[PDB]
């Protein structure tokens, strides 16, 4: 009998406790040892209907991964002073020498571990005086922590089983006659990014575009690639030399002093590489909308930076890379693209519940490598004279990251 389930999740991994990375310990300590040597039993003449858009597994995973943040904002990560008015100066100083209005070196009186002993020190704003806090500003990065998506395996509930559709082209919302029972999931990483899908799954056949209602322009357009595109993100400069904690509730997080070749950060990815994939996408789209309709892509028309540009986590530090150039083109039915990005630490997590703030990056520079495995777009629409259809970068609901994986998974109850 094929019922449910609905709902629960049981995470797991083979990562050892020797690693202290935040996502590793969320899978090593907050979850249980996994089971290597995966195995599937294909069902014989059985058709299972999936529903990714009302899938409780996605809801659970979305809640859980967000809830995992509670694990950090409790022990060591805090919401405390200081928010003393920081007074900002010009670019500092000798080695840079750069046209960057984003790195704001601002000074303030920092109270030490001593009751009433202040000290003039420097910090960094990004984007006068102030321009900080005024909200649930959750500070402190603590030692170790470190954020990077780690493969987490989810195994069937006690008494229940996980069904997995093996359909190379599955809308995630229909019947699948090709379905197998599997002990646990392949291992789903807590991908933290907007607009772009980093290190997700790939379609077996062609680029799979999915959306509850593709005609409904409030719905996000999930575009699962059949090929990876390597994004190599690198910090051109260096600074914030490690962390210097001051007192029980005091810390010199940020600045450093060593500075370097300060300049706008960015990621390297051959522009032709994902230009290929955009070719694939517009071919899929035009076949969905008119069978011969011109497909135009455009950048964000506004909104919070987090969803306006490509926000993603690299090593705990959040980068906001403007990828307008990756959209600004039209497809009618050695050079690489270089995207301008910005590092923050202030991030809006949950539903405006608070703003997590980490730092310092520690050490210097940084390198993160992740392969794009799909996009999230949103269609404009128009009248009968719309002709060419316009897609702009979407995002805003990280749950989509889980949808792109769980569309083929479904826990089931048997009698």
């Amino acid at each position, epitope marked *: 009998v094929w019922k449910d389930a609905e709902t629960t999740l049981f995470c797991a991994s083979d990562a050892k406790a020797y690693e202290t990375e935040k996502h590793n310990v969320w899978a090593t300590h907050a979850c249980v040892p996994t089971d290597p040597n995966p195995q599937e039993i294909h069902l014989e003449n059985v058709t299972e209907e999936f529903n990714m858009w009302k899938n409780n597994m996605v809801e659970q995973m979305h809640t859980d991964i967000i809830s995992l943040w509670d694990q950090s904002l409790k022990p060591c990560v805090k919401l405390t002073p200081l928010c003393v008015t920081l007074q900002c100066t010009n670019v500092t100083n000798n080695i840079t020498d750069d046209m960057r209005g984003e790195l704001k070196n601002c000074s303030f009186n920092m109270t030490t571990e001593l009751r009433d002993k202040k000290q003039k020190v420097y910090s960094l704003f990004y984007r006068y005086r102030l321009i900080n806090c005024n909200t649930s500003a959750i500070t402190q990065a603590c030692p170790k922590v470190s954020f990077e998506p780690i493969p987490i395996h989810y195994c069937a509930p006690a008494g229940f089983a996980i069904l997995k559709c093996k359909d190379k082209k599955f809308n995630g919302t229909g019947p699948c006659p090709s379905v197998s029972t599997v002990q646990c999931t392949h291992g789903i990483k807590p991908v933290v990014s907007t607009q772009l899908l980093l290190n997700g799954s790939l379609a077996e056949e062609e680029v799979m575009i999915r959306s509850e209602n593709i005609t409904n322009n409030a719905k996000n357009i999930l575009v699962q690639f059949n090929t990876p595109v390597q994004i190599n993100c690198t910090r051109p400069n260096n600074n914030t030399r490690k962390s210097i904690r001051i007192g029980p509730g005091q810390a010199f997080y940020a600045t450093g002093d060593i500075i370097g070749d300060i300049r706008q950060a960015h990621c390297n990815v051959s522009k032709a590489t994902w230009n290929e994939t955009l070719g694939k996408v517009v071919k899929q789209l035009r076949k969905h909308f008119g069978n011969n309709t011109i497909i135009r892509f455009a950048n964000s028309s506004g909104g*919070d930076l987090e969803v306006t540009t490509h926000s993603f986590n690299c090593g705990g530090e959040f980068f906001y890379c403007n990828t307008s150039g990756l959209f600004n083109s039209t497809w009618i039915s050695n050079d690489s693209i270089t995207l301008p990005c910005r590092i923050k630490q202030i991030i809006n997590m949950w539903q405006r519940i608070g703003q997590a703030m980490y730092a310092p990056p520690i050490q210097g520079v940084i390198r993160c490598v992740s392969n794009i495995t799909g996009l999230i777009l949103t269609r404009d629409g128009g009248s009968t004279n719309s002709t060419t259809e316009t897609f702009r970068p979407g995002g805003g609901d990280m749950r989509d990251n889980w949808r792109s994986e769980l569309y083929k998974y479904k826990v089931v109850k048997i009698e």
Partner: antibody
Amino acid sequence: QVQLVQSGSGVKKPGASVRVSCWTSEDIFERTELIHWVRQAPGQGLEWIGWVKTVTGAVNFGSPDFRQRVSLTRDRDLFTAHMDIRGLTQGDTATYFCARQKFYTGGQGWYFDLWGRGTLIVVSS
Amino acid sequence: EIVLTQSPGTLSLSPGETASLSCTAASYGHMTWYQKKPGQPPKLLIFATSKRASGIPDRFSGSQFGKQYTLTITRMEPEDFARYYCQQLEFFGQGTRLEIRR
């Protein structure tokens, strides 16, 4: 369906700009995902403008014309929505409403929980 | 095809009669339908095609035949006469004026 508290009716000139405000109680603001906007010409039907997300502030419109002409901003802390229109033209003379679309509308189409009071914007020198 | 063709543009029927409005969709999907009185904001009467909103009289029913969105208003009262509009996603219909037949 308690009306969403909009700004008073206003008169601007061609080439001018205006921020038409619309705000309501916390509950409704938290119930609604996007804030949409729609205008009607005098003696005409409904002409849909665009929407702005209450979670992210992301925007999208029925036309690039609205993308440039109309800037939709929002503030959760103030539970208020702003509509800024620049390069006001004669054809922008119309009555404007905001409308709230709750979460979990599924595939039921665009239905709205609350509607705005209504703001008449006139563009004339 | 134009997204919506709401008709007729004007419908005059006497009190106690049943109004039958047709909004022809260019596509498939669930429909919504609003009342709008003179000087008053639009007001959701029917959503999801055939699911009336809370606080809406049962005499307001809805359906669809293929793409022909159907709207039924039985036993119309004198206070049930106004402007009405269909909507499919971000698009509105042509608009209808419901009037009293004399």
